[PDB]
Design a protein around this ligand. Sequence first.
Ligand SMILES: [Zn+2]
Lengths: 101, 213, 135
Amino acid sequence: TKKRRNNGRAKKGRGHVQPIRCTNCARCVPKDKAIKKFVIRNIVEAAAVRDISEASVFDAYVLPKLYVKLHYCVSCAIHSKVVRNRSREARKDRTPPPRFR
Amino acid sequence: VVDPFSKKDWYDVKAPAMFNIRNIGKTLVTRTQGTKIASDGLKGRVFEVSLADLQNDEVAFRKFKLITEDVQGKNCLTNFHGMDLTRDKMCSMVKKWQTMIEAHVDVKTTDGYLLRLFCVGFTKKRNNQIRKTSYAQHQQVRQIRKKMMEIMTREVQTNDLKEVVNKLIPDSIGKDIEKACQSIYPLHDVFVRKVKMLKKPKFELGKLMELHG
Amino acid sequence: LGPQVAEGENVFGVCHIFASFNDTFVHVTDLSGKETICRVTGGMKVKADRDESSPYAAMLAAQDVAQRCKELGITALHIKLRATGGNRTKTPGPGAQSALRALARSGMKIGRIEDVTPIPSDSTRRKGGRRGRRL
RNA sequence: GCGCAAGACGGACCAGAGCGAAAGCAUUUGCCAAGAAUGUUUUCAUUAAUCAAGAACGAAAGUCGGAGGUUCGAAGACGAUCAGAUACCGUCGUAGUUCCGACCAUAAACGAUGCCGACCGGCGAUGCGGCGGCGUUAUUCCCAUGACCCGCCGGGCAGCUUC
Ligand SMILES: [Zn+2]
């Protein structure tokens, strides 16, 4: 029986969507079906910042960041705990998780 | 046995006269033995130096390439070779709910240098805008690209390399492109993200001393 | 030994750090990248293949590089951090973090840090298949 | 690190966004023919809907000749795992993957939902065209014109809610 009204996708009013490769498997996934994450991290972690500024020759130097867009297939987002399963009604909640709090 | 670095002379690298700071660092090269000339060894090296290390009072997300052409007695003299932005800067500028507009031109300077210039710009959201997206229509970006393509041509064709570079240090070309596109669609982060150097004239020693004051 | 410089002046090199998920390269060259000063990997320290990507092996590599650089007047370094890139991963390896502390604790000065991983505008087909790696 | 060359590929911007009869379609510029929607106090005046026969196109794989062969890679040769592995993992690698010209006419070719027409509840958005209206902005002005703001109408992709 049918589970999702959108068939697990975002495809509406078009026939074909170009595929992409999963970051973890290298598996072909439609771009509208893949699980996408934008990660903006710091190059150095908080375990290394105190040892980096004390050696920096520039006063008030701001350390750079790192920008990566990651694509997952449905299997890796579940195995890596990126995406969980949830109840039938909760499945209809498409608000992003309250991380911004 | 013997340290291979015991056969190496150190040379200083000088930036051209367009920049306040002239000393940019040091390099090393093995000494001469027969037909193995050190000066022939260190000609053609490219140094990618941040602008803040050349203009101490400028931005640090701009980088300039300098290529060595001569070695005048323990000093090697460099000339402009290229320019580009930083990956961090570009990746921070690229955002989702806006539009990206890019262009590229090939222009030859008066003194014989051929350059390929790339330009980028992004659509800007208004102060009172309620809508999420700020996309531009296709004929609105063909006008913007047409204006980027003509301002880059006129500001390189007219003048020579020495005062073309002085227009890249403050990035005045992007500031003119931004002003001239607000009547089509207001732009947000307009930069000359890259300048690539294609052809050079026949090398003349006379005109390299001029570039070093 | 090294350049004849006053004591209050920094002499800069460039440290290419290539941290994959199988090995880690620490590679100090001059300001142009044409003449290399030192290169130490994780495999040069440990003998087990599984520990070449270890954060600990990347620490013994940057201490043996900083020791050799503090022998030729190289007092400061600009950092160029690399991942495998291309079709493969864009995220640096586990030894990436521990190589920026070993050469900092050793006494080096740090200049500017930048990412130099290769991103294709668009590239050739990736290894695996349309079903990926099934393990 | 500096160059040279070869073929493939158009990332990030890229969205429950757009176009096409469907397969399908994404770097710049130029040429060529085509198309929907909107606008209309233009024109013809029933010229229409669905369709046996008969036709055009039709992913991928596959077949014939030419060209080229980067990457990936059925078959095959190996190295591992295993009680056994003719598999899953790894190293190579043929046909193929690319282009030109002919065949092939098949897909979970799916919204698993033929096409044309009328009636039957609300609400907020979005893409295109048009109409109206304070006020910001293109620096200080003339109007049009663009970017926002608040609505209305038509045709689209959808969404939420309802005894
Ligand atoms: Zn996966």
